[PDB]
Amino acid sequence: DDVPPRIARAMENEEYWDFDIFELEAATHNRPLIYLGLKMFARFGICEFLHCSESTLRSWLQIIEANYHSSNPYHNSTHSADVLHATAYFLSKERIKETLDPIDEVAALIAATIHDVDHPGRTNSFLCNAGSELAILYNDTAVLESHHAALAFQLTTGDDKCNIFKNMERNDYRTLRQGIIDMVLATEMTKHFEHVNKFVNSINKPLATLEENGETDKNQEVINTMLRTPENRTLIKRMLIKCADVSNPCRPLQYCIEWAARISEEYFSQTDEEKQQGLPVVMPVFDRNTCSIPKSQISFIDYFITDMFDAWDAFVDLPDLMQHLDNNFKYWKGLDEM
Ligand SMILES: Nc1nc(Cl)nc2c1ncn2Cc1cc(OCC(F)F)ccn1
Ligand SMILES: [Mg+2]
Ligand SMILES: [Zn+2]
């Protein structure tokens, strides 16, 4: 409640897409998730739904954010705060409110908070090839993604003060647990095109068929009934967490460049270690001695981001994000200068 002024000023216009997350990072001293989490959870009313105190929520945000590695350029507390901001923005849209339930809103915001907890600044492929403790523990199968969700519940339910899922019905927690686990696992790279294609085939293509008929009152209930099913709601949640996780190319110009620099620097750390130890180089293009950052972002946007956000835009309607995506794509093209 009694928040200091710079951090209060940093979280002024938080409902808007244009948001200075790096000012909040600098203001909070690499503790943006606890301050942004408290406001976002209070605005939606998470602890009113979950039945918990503010002290229970603060201890949960404290222990979670502590396990985020500050030494990592990209995968740190500030990334999850940005993903939590992206998640809350999509939940606030007219399409998502009428489609999803309050249990899904809570599942999304909690998942966004924990989705990269205890990230070692290294990919799944690095851990499997190196033979890391988690690679052996999870059998080279969603090594990081399973560790993020597992460790999050270990820290939450393990301690009594940190447990936000204390005063809940066994059925409500069981449903909410499965919802969070699914969204955290859906962020995995290998399952990208599977989750994108299912969103197009099961939601967008049927919805395009029904919208061609008209705006009839009976037709809206057919659209509502179809989208609100347990299967399609899960596919929307899978798509929402995936877009929110990689929303940095659809941000304002100065924020887009900063996120690109961090994730690039993180891959160069991995590439130097792989060459030193004598491991198989999984990302040869991302080497500090050879990598064009502008050209790499153009490759990244064309392969993954363009088609994903196109489908997501068709469903939700996101004029700000696609306008930023166009401006940032043209900016990287301008930096060639040859
Ligand atoms: N601007 C970005 N560029 C690159 Cl090269 N990687 C990024 C970026 N922002 C997050 N990451 C991590 C990531 C994300 C990823 O997402 C696949 C799909 F969700 F986009 C696949 C592999 N690494
Ligand atoms: Mg991850
Ligand atoms: Zn992530």
Distances (CA, A) of 186 to 107, 111, 114, 228, 289: 13, 11, 13, 20, 33
Q: How far apart are CA 146 and CA 184, in angstroms?
A: 8
SS3 325: helix
Task: Give the closest residue to 243 by CA, choosing from 320, 309, 323, 316.
Answer: 309
Q: Which of 29, 69, 75, 85 is catalytic?
A: 75
Give me the residues near ligand 3 (ion), CB cutoff below 5 Å.
Answer: 116, 245
SS3 18: coil
Place of tokens 């929110």: 244
Nearest CA to ligand 1 atom 6: 263
User: Which element (helix H / strand E) includes 139?
Assistant: none
Ligand-binding annotation for 115, yes or no, is yes
> Which ligand minimizes its atom distance to the CA of 120?
2
Pocket test for ligand 1, best of 199, 240, 246 (most atoms within 8 A of CB): 246
Q: How far apart are CA 215 and CA 206, in angstroms?
A: 15
Tokens matching residue 131: 């033979």
Place of tokens 């999050």: 152
Q: How far apart are CA 138 and CA 120, in angstroms?
A: 15
C-alpha 300 – ligand 1 centre gap (Å): 7
Q: How far apart are CA 249 and CA 5, in angstroms?
A: 30
> Which ligand minimizes its atom distance to the CA of 83?
3
Nearest CA to ligand 1 atom 15: 189
Phi, psi at 85, each rounded to 5°: -65, -45
For residues 227-254, one letter each, b for 16 or more C-beta atoms within 10 angstroms of the residue's C-beta and e for the rest, the string is beeeebbbbbbbbbbbbbbbbbbbbeee
Say if CB 282 and CB 126 are below 8 A apart.
yes
Place of tokens 């403790």: 133
Say if CB 134 and CB 144 are below 8 A apart.
yes
Tokens matching residue 90: 């999509």
Ligand-binding annotation for 116, yes or no, is yes
Instruction: For the chain, state the CA radius of gyration.
Output: 20
Tokens matching residue 239: 């798509």
Q: How far apart are CA 229 and CA 225, in angstroms?
A: 7
Tokens matching residue 219: 């037709």
Tokens matching residue 186: 């859906």
Nearest CA to ligand 1 atom 22: 189
C-alpha 337 – ligand 2 centre gap (Å): 34
SS3 77: helix
DSSP H helical ranges for the chain: 5-10, 21-28, 32-44, 46-50, 54-66, 77-91, 94-99, 102-114, 124-130, 133-137, 143-158, 170-186, 192-199, 205-211, 217-227, 230-245, 253-277, 293-300, 306-316, 319-334
Say if CB 267 and CB 156 are below 8 A apart.
no
State yes or no: is 85 an active-site residue. no
Q: How far apart are CA 95 and CA 269, in angstroms?
A: 41
SS3 162: coil
Q: How far apart are CA 24 and CA 27, in angstroms?
A: 5
Q: How far apart are CA 99 and CA 229, in angstroms?
A: 9
Place of tokens 């509502």: 224
- Ligand 1: which residues within 6 Å by Cβ? 189, 192, 242, 246, 248-249, 259-260, 263, 297, 300, 304-305
Amino acid present at 315: F
Q: How far apart are CA 163 and CA 293, in angstroms?
A: 42
Tokens matching residue 137: 């523990």
Ligand-binding annotation for 245, yes or no, is yes
Mutual angle of helices 32-44 and 77-91, in 10-degree steps = 20
Atom of ligand 1 nearest to the CA of 74: 10
Q: What is the DSSP letter of 318?
A: -
Q: What is the DSSP letter of 285?
A: S
Distances (CA, A) of 116 to 24, 111, 195: 19, 9, 19
Q: What is the DSSP letter of 163?
A: -
Amino acid present at 88: A
Say if CB 293 and CB 264 are below 8 A apart.
yes
Residue 37 CB: number of other CB atoms within 10 A? 24
C-alpha 49 – ligand 3 centre gap (Å): 26
C-alpha 221 – ligand 3 centre gap (Å): 35
> Which ligand minimizes its atom distance to the CA of 119?
2
Mutual angle of helices 306-316 and 319-334, in 10-degree steps = 160
